[PDB]
Design a protein around this nucleic acid. Structure first.
Lengths: 283, 285, 288, 288
DNA sequence: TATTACGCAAACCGTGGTATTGGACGGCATGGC
DNA sequence: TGCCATGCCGTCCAATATGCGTAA
């Protein structure tokens, strides 16, 4: 079986004659009878004569998917349809990353996403291999073939129990915070949030008081919700109305958002994300 | 062209063009030239596969309809009933669904059957698009236009190594299992069996000690046969007499799992209607 | 078998080389090497290989970290006994109760018992029963536990369940919805990989109510699920602790039913209990 | 904080008088009292009150005496745990399988290895021959099991045993070929094969001199057996598949010169872990 | 009106030792209660 | 008279350096 025999058969069916369709497609009569006579051999039955209803219901359905299939394969390359395998790590989940995907899904409504938790490292392997598309965290070291895109900057906020709201007012700076018993995060991750918080202190001269380092951002505020600790978080987390906790920005003391992706052989839906995240960067 | 699709599907299988030609007894220049012609006729980079995997999917669909148009037309001319395309997910494939298929093929002798493995969700996509007439599994969520009919219900059986066989006996309750290392299944087929087993445990106030979930039933029973872990199967598998594995009927009130099938109620082809009449005719049996 | 042979080995396995480790330890390379060849003698197994660790190296790593962090706990365990303080209650947790539940119990406990402190450690519903029976953890919190022969399971309270949809979907369910109201909501659950946990009970509670539910996705934790919900790509189900927090662009709707509660629970080894856990267990039972 | 003070302070407490401790320790007394100064200086707390009649443990004395024995078990017991890891006595053998050996062959090999290494475990995941090698090289999988493995750099094939082939046909059709049969008897039978495998089966007819009549083709073994016991197909299966008493299926031993499929065992050549290093010790030895 | 009988053009395949100096830690002797 | 601390010194450890149109 081949394609010409199916369009012929449909044309011969709609025209009711092996010559009325021969003009409906602009070719002489011998080939009309040359291919349907050969069509009834690629099948075995006698469709028409000087089972035909059974093979017609299929032939119009074989070409229908053929045209529709071409419109999928092309639109797939245009990145209009496709699942984005997003990987993440840490603080930008609470507010940052969700707004970036929902804004990207407004940009490309047919696309879907799949979240896969991964450390800043397992992203690099996951990107250099092709398991994931983008990896979200804050502090990424360079890697010979991975490009970073710094999107924006977040403020850092002190978290404290509501009982001690007035003890630090609305907002206070970094030096006001030498005796605060900061309990940071995360335990996992070789140089992540806490390590850079410690860094912004030494660059500011104050050696920080740190009592414990817990697993999550939500584990440091868990201790704060019980008054058993005080922590410091990005503006993403402080945007959430956390019960029993009070927040205060810290006043050259920002941390960034950065997605990482492989620079070679980029899938289309990934490049449509890169398009939306770069236009969303400078704005 | 039809010669083009084949080549492409043989090339996505192969990964390189040289091996694919070996599978077609052709050379590399022919398939390369035709893939160039096809990439140009479609308008998408298909190269080492590219973002035109959707074309691979639709081309598999097209060749499926080509074959199932040939065979369909033949059997329709013969006055036969045709070829009932049945999908299956999970454990029914082991014993239950084969008996149902035999009971249908003997009653409708002019009819044949074809099996392709799909998930509970892949089965609804197949029932819609016209890929399959009926799908078979255990726990189906309702879906508009699709109808579910459970043929019968099966008992559950603990499956433990023949050494740890005399410990449980001929039958055992769920409460006997509060400290048993259960290796369940199937891993990754959406909510299916293992989730129902956990639900049956959680329904009796027992949060179960579960150590593993492996590929399908055969992997769990292979870790059982290997004296590594015990599992829970339904009676379809337990009635296959697996070597070195002993089964004890898990007795209880809500300890049973159904065999259900799904089909489209909109446009029911005649073979599907005959098979549904048989299935309902075997609802009480 | 010597403490400096432990501090050297740990910094080696962490930095990944016998030079940045000596840099991280303020020593030279010869003594770092000389103490490892002495370490490989008292134990008898090759730990390091030209740097990665042998399987002997990793199994010995978790032993050496248990030793050092034990001495660090004792360093403060003694100074608090001098002042007669109640001390450190090492508590573990797994799952949804960390968002509101467990913070409030520790809040009230640290009010009634003032001289005590707490350490939070994220373990698994069976990684706890290991720590309990070994003493590394006093009480571990989570939802659904299996009975273990040495551990006493105790329930604390019930929490409700809330369907989590985007703020736009809020009118579809209003304030209250039942389980059957969700028969066709593509749900994104959690936690992924923490043995049988939350998602497996939600699958049960539907299955218990005769609803084989639609499950779309399972992600790492609750935070990752509500993220896909506040982005519109998901609709989730969270307990009361997660919903008691006001989350942006997310509308929570209570699930109404006669068997739709999930519990708060802690576990403790009932054999040789330290006195601070006793002052703690006498406070959690009073919560009922 | 060093180990010598831990053995002393316990002996000082167990003796009740530091003088008696030095004898049980086979040392002179001035070390005892001198070590306890540095011990209480590194800790920064008072453990012992001294009189002319002996000592008595302070509040820190008891509180640290428990921490002391706990540190000293692990120090001694960490050596025995590390020797087991290096010895391969402990470890999870992460096996990956593909196809028909899972029905009987691989279970018995895992059983024979576990019988010979009882303090070990097995994680059984399912992978394609390409996922195995793409995983063995990376390291996510210890050993891969399947029928026919392609020679690849970095790995090592081990053809351990051979399995005869068996005609699978329905119980009704069972008297048509006998308890055994040669390859040529199967000229007319319509064979529903499955992969890989089905490529090698046709090879076995073609290598004995037959162009077989292939009817259908699935890609699951239980899918071929399903059609067979349903009265819709016949197939050719390994002995592991025929070893299972299949409910309505009958099996007939295919006999002939070199008509058998092998059981192959694939693993990475370099840098093999202990639990694998013993497992291959059990693979090659059991080849007899 | 549908097959047939032709020919020509077109399609398409063959780190680990070595040496020294500083400290640790024990063992005898004395002082303090 | 035990029992605990304090010096002094010697030895050991450790760490830096073919497929159509045309014709029949």
């Amino acid at each position: 079986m081949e394609f010409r025999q199916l369009k012929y058969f449909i044309a011969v069916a709609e025209a009711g004659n092996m010559a009325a369709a021969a003009k409906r497609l602009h070719v002489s009569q011998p080939p009309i009878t040359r291919q349907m006579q050969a069509l009834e051999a690629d099948l075995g039955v006698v469709l028409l004569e000087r089972a035909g209803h059974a093979f017609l219901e299929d032939a119009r359905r074989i070409l229908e998917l053929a045209g529709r299939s071409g419109d999928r394969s092309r639109a797939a390359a245009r990145g209009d349809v496709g699942e984005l395998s997003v990987a993440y790590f840490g603080t930008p989940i609470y507010r940052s990353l969700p707004l970036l995907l929902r804004a990207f899904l407004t940009s490309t409504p047919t696309a879907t996403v799949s979240l896969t938790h991964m450390t800043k490292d397992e992203q690099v392997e996951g990107l250099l291999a092709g398991t994931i598309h983008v990896g979200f965290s804050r502090f990424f070291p360079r890697h010979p073939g991975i490009e970073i895109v710094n999107i924006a900057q977040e403020d850092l906020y002190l978290a404290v129990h509501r009982s001690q709201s007035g003890k630090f007012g609305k907002t206070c700076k970094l030096a006001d915070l030498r005796a605060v018993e900061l309990t940071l995060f995360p335990r996992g991750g070789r140089p992540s949030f806490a390590d850079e918080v410690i860094g912004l202190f030494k660059h500011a001269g104050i050696e920080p008081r740190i009592a414990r380092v817990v697993e999550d951002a939500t584990a440091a505020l868990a201790l704060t919700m019980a008054g058993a600790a005080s922590s410091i978080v990005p503006a993403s987390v402080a945007a959430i109305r956390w019960p029993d906790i009070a927040f205060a920005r810290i006043v050259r003391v920002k941390v960034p958002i950065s997605c990482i992706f492989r620079k070679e052989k980029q899938p289309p839906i990934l490049a449509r994300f890169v398009e939306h995240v770069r236009r969303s960067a400078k704005d």
